[PDB]
Design a protein around this ligand. Sequence first.
Ligand code: 9XM
Length: 488
Amino acid sequence: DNAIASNILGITSKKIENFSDWYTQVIVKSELIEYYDISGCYILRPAAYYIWECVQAFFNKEIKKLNVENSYFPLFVTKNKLEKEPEVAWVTKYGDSNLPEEIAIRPTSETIMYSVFPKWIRSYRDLPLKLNQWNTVVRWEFKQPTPFIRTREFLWQEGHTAHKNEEEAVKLVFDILDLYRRWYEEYLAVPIIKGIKSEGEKFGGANFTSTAEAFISENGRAIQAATSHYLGTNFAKMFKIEFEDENEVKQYVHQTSWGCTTRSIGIMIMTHGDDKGLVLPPNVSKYKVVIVPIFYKTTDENAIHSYCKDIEKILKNAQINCVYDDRASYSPGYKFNHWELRGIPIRIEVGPKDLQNNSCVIVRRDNNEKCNVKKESVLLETQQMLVDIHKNLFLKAKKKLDDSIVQVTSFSEVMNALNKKKMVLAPWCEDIATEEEIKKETQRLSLTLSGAMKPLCIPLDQPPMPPNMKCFWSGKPAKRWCLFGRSY
Ligand SMILES: O=C(C[C@H]1NCCC[C@@H]1OC(=O)NS(=O)(=O)N1CCN(C(=O)Nc2nccnc2C(=O)NC2Cc3ccccc3C2)CC1)Cn1cnc2cc(Br)c(Cl)cc2c1=O
């Protein structure tokens, strides 16, 4: 429990050698996650919840442009109402007395909301209806949990809309999907692959499911990053959500729903984190800069302290939040590891020579590259470097994603691509019967998580398909290229 020894040790598992232990150490030592006495439930500490507040402000600002309004619906669903559509958590008593009708924690708010929609929708003048919630949902599974990405309770947003026809809803589905892209690219520097889910992997209530897929290249696992469904009139028939149209004729509404969870944070940690600890894209880090003082003698102490307070004022006047670790009990080297492990994008060092030159040293977190900068240039160099740190993080990640995809044309090359922690891009006939056949065979040939291969998504960005190409599995005419891989 010695501070210096713990500081020098940092993360002690190498990301590439022991990924599972590497991930646990990072989330605990960078002060993101705390554990709890109920399995599969975790505490979001400030540094983690700050990230959620950043993406929440962005997604709010964007869905307002689509005229989507936030709201809040009850945490509880009556058994009577939920079972009008079996791992839900059930409230059965208050104090010591049983409830006459059991009560479920929402796993999602479909039945809670769509049950009231008919009261709000009477004619076309009431459409479209566009609602969003920021809440938690509970799903009591006994699979092995994993912080951020696979938990019994998790924070998310769920948005639900209803439209007068199909095209206006289908357009909204993909408009939201691109906001999920920007959520991951512009804020978490994580590249995703837009696609359509296979028939066997889509949401049971949707006509189609569009998805944003991410890939964890260190363990070879694909993970769904966000989702956006076109529900059609399926839920309008269940709940009788009708309206009178412009011709005075009763019609069903066309609905969409879409969500993104704190799994996005987990994906971001697994992408950018290195053997030093957390690595934060500037847009989700509270402190963009850490100012560390360095003292050669005891005489230059009052000057360097004042010089660091000048740089702090320069950055904070430009609304660039920072922190000046003026603690006298720790060495500069200690502070370097301290804030590197916590993922601060930029470190500014001020020493005696840097003060004699009226300059400073600015170190990047992603690649540890240093450069000397004049004091009057500190603000401009910091601004451009925060932008380049993001771009570098994203481009390096997009490289790892692209290199994780092996385009194949026969099944005889599938197992070799899987065992190299990759996913295959294969031409597929999209027949639903083949989805389980591919799972059973890929896991059979694999010799804890599963070894089976499942249809991840059919990408929107389709490679050229020669009109005579056949399915990599059945040999029947192929329809589109499909990503297949191992998942959680
Ligand atoms: O809701 C819907 C329809 C839509 N509704 C509005 C819009 C949004 C919806 O769009 C989706 O399709 N969302 S999705 O949830 O399917 N999708 C999103 C992307 N994913 C995440 O990011 N997930 C997470 N993020 C962070 C942490 N953990 C997880 C996570 O998965 N934990 C679990 C796995 C795991 C592993 C170990 C331990 C515990 C656990 C729990 C998960 C996949 C479908 N659905 C799902 N399930 C239901 C369940 C019941 Br019970 C009933 Cl009754 C109904 C439904 C139902 O209707």
